[PDB]
Amino acid sequence: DPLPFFPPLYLGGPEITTENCEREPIHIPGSIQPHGALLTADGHSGEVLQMSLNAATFLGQEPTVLRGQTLAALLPEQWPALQAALPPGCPDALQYRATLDWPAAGHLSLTVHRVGELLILEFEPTEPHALRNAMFALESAPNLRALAEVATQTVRELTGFDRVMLYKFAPDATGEVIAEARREGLHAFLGHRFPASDIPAQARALYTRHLLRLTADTRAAAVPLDPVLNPQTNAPTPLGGAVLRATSPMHMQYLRNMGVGSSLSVSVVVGGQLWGLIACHHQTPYVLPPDLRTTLEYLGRLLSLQVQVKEALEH
Amino acid sequence: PFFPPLYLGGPEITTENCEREPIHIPGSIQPHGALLTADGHSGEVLQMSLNAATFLGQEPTVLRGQTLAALLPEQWPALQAALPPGCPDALQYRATLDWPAAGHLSLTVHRVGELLILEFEPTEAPHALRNAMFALESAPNLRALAEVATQTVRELTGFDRVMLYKFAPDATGEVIAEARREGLHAFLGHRFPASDIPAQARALYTRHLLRLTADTRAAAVPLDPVLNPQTNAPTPLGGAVLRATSPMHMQYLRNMGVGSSLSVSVVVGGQLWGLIACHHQTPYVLPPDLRTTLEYLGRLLSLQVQVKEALEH
Numbered sequence: 001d002p003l004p005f006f007p008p009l010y011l012g013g014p015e016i017t018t019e020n021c022e023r024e025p026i027h028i029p030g031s032i033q034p035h036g037a038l039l040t041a042d043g044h045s046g047e048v049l050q051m052s053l054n055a056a057t058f059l060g061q062e063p064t065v066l067r068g069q070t071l072a073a074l075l076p077e078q079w080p081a082l083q084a085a086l087p088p089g090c091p092d093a094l095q096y097r098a099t100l101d102w103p104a105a106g107h108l109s110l111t112v113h114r115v116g117e118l119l120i121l122e123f124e125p126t127e128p129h130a131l132r133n134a135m136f137a138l139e140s141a142p143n144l145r146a147l148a149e150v151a152t153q154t155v156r157e158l159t160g161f162d163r164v165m166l167y168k169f170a171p172d173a174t175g176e177v178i179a180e181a182r183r184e185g186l187h188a189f190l191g192h193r194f195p196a197s198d199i200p201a202q203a204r205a206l207y208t209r210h211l212l213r214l215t216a217d218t219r220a221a222a223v224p225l226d227p228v229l230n231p232q233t234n235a236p237t238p239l240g241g242a243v244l245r246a247t248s249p250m251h252m253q254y255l256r257n258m259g260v261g262s263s264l265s266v267s268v269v270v271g272g273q274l275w276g277l278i279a280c281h282h283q284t285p286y287v288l289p290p291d292l293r294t295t296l297e298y299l300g301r302l303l304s305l306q307v308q309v310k311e312a313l314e315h
Numbered sequence: 316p317f318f319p320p321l322y323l324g325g326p327e328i329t330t331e332n333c334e335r336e337p338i339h340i341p342g343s344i345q346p347h348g349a350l351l352t353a354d355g356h357s358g359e360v361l362q363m364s365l366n367a368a369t370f371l372g373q374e375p376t377v378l379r380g381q382t383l384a385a386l387l388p389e390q391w392p393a394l395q396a397a398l399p400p401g402c403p404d405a406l407q408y409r410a411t412l413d414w415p416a417a418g419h420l421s422l423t424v425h426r427v428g429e430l431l432i433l434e435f436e437p438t439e440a441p442h443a444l445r446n447a448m449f450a451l452e453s454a455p456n457l458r459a460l461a462e463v464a465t466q467t468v469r470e471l472t473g474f475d476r477v478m479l480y481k482f483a484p485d486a487t488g489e490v491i492a493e494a495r496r497e498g499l500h501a502f503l504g505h506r507f508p509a510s511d512i513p514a515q516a517r518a519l520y521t522r523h524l525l526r527l528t529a530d531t532r533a534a535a536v537p538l539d540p541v542l543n544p545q546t547n548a549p550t551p552l553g554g555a556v557l558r559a560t561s562p563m564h565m566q567y568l569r570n571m572g573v574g575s576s577l578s579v580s581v582v583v584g585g586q587l588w589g590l591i592a593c594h595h596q597t598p599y600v601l602p603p604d605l606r607t608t609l610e611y612l613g614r615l616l617s618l619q620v621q622v623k624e625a626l627e628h
């Protein structure tokens with residue numbers, strides 16, 4: 001039965017069980033994963049409102065100094081570019097990316113998107129023809145099976161992940177692994193099917209708009225935003241669109257129990273519906289840098305197109 | 316059918332027989348790169364472009380005996396695996412060579428039956444592609460998508476004019492969006508006859524998704540031999556971006572005052588929906604890595620055109 005979200009934990013909401021699963025507000029956890037930092041800022045003035053508690057250590061500045069400046073002063077070269085790329089009223093799915101040379105922290109990748117009157121800024125550390133070669137190989141795959149196999153093998157070669165699967169949703173939202181590339185010694189998930197509740201209906205809705213989520217370390221504690229609520233609204237900060245967003249503790253338990261230290265998946269979206277996932281596992285924690293993740297994002301789109309094409313060749 | 320090419324004493328092309336010029340088999344290439352053909356098994360260099368000596372820095376005869384194994388040691392096994400016998404002519408493999416004579420070359424290979432076609436071009440060596448991808452996806456409708464696409468391509472390439480050129484059901488063409496330098500004629504809204512891109516050119520553009528005329532006044536460079544030794548027949552060059560352009564079309568480009576031209580096919584439901592069409596007033600060799608960006612954009616636009624057309628119908 002579909003039911004509306006509970007309030008999050010920090011607003012006195014209940015703790016989540018196998019029973020009320022589908023009502024966790026996974027988009028507003030009030031916290032981020034510790035391998036990057038996040039700031040929120042007023043979309044018109046550029047006043048800095050919220051920051052992750054670890055921000056001082058990524059950005060090399062005291063909180064009170066950060067919060068006491070506008071983005072115009074903090075990001076003089078990027079602030080006008082942000083404002084042109086992310087105009088008021090734009091969708092929350094639109095992202096702008098730049099690379100910064102920050103004194104204390106080396107090269108940072110900056111990813112920005114806009115939710116209403118809020119700008120959300122994510123900072124992460126950042127670092128030949130493999131993509132072009134893959135694009136052509138995908139297109140020349142003769143059928144859906146060969147496409148799925150080429151796609152899994154390519155992603156594994158690009159990333160070094162221990163396991164890369166192509167998980168396909170059935171009409172009842174039960175899923176099935178239809179191809180996989182895996183490290184020697186791992187047991188096969190190929191052909192196994194998993195119940196629909198493994199990915200509850202509110203996650204699948206989110207996965208249709210924001211096409212990549214990840215869990216870099218399934219044992220890492222989440223880092224709170226400070227303050228936790230958006231001071232504009234005294235309400236929760238929407239983090240659906242932020243890759244740094246904390247993963248559900250239900251899903252992190254489900255991962256640790258499998259022996260997985262790192263998770264990542266890309267949505268494959270066909271005709272406006274979530275067709276399936278490029279899901280990846282690593283046994284140890286593992287951070288895939290932003291520019292490599294971009295390659296996977298591009299492959300997500302290519303695969304969406306090629307899945308349509310291969311399936312049309314099939315009636 | 317097709318007329319024989321000129322160099323096999325076929326008729327010269329006119330506006331009476333546009334549909335029959337065998338543009339895939341011109342027997343020549345554009346001079347900003349070099350092309351070798353080679354045997355699929357032996358790696359034996361069978362044809363070369365008369366300009367190969369320039370790019371490769373090799374005494375002419377040296378090449379036309381040697382083997383790819385010898386000539387490209389690191390690459391030759393990769394090719395063997397990447398382009399297995401029986402693969403499609405559409406499948407391409409690329410690498411960057413740090414080659415003694417020329418700082419860096421791009422190498423592009425595909426296979427047509429028993430022949431490997433190798434293309435060499437100068438090359439080199441950020442977020443504009445990722446930023447463009449998200450911009451295309453958040454365009455609210457087909458019109459805005461067209462506008463974003465043309466603007467994005469112009470910004471990435473510096474081309475004087477970028478158009479989105481949409482085919483009607485009878486293959487009449489219509490410019491539905493345009494991004495252009497100040498002080499050019501506007502082609503926005505204009506419609507053109509089907510014959511401007513004849514049926515044989517459209518079919519070849521459904522399979523091979525990018526072509527260009529880097530300089531509308533440059534002479535083609537012959538293949539030597541012109542005929543493939545294997546077959547004593549013309550080498551198919553349709554999958555080669557170095558292919559000499561139709562003189563008919565070079566005449567069209569010159570009459571419009573274009574000096575450099577490039578287009579990318581937008582393919583939806585197995586059919587040619589339209590083209591990203593680029594003009595420059597002067598000669599312009601777009602480097603391979605930037606062309607790759609446009610090739611990606613072509614696929615992304617193909618996806619988004621279907622998405623957007625579905626939310627009208």
Ligand SMILES: *C/C=C1/C(=C/c2[nH]c(/C=C3[NH+]=C(/C=C4\NC(=O)C(C=C)=C4C)C(C)=C\3CCC(=O)O)c(CCC(=O)O)c2C)NC(=O)[C@H]1C
Pocket residue numbers: 017018019020021022024026175177189194195197198199200203213214215246247248250251254263264265277279280
């Ligand atoms: C009470 C709720 C439970 C639940 C919730 C849940 N699951 C996700 C996300 C995912 N679950 C996945 C399931 C699988 N991963 C596999 O490898 C296999 C099979 C071999 C299955 C069936 C997957 C792939 C995801 C996607 C995320 C990822 O790739 O890591 C969420 C949403 C988490 C988030 O985005 O924060 C939630 C709430 N899962 C259960 O099993 C029950 C107990």
Ligand SMILES: *C/C=C1/C(=C/c2[nH]c(/C=C3[NH+]=C(/C=C4\NC(=O)C(C=C)=C4C)C(C)=C\3CCC(=O)O)c(CCC(=O)O)c2C)NC(=O)[C@H]1C
Pocket residue numbers: 328329330331332333334336338488502507510511512513516526527528559560561563564567576577578590592593
């Ligand atoms: C006897 C036939 C003639 C003919 C042949 C022909 N045309 C092409 C290719 C193209 N024609 C194009 C037409 C236009 N480009 C524009 O910018 C506009 C409008 C402002 C039009 C109408 C285009 C875009 C192409 C594709 C190539 C490109 O991007 O430049 C070919 C094939 C060329 C080749 O691949 O070698 C041929 C044989 N053109 C005529 O006008 C008639 C008289």
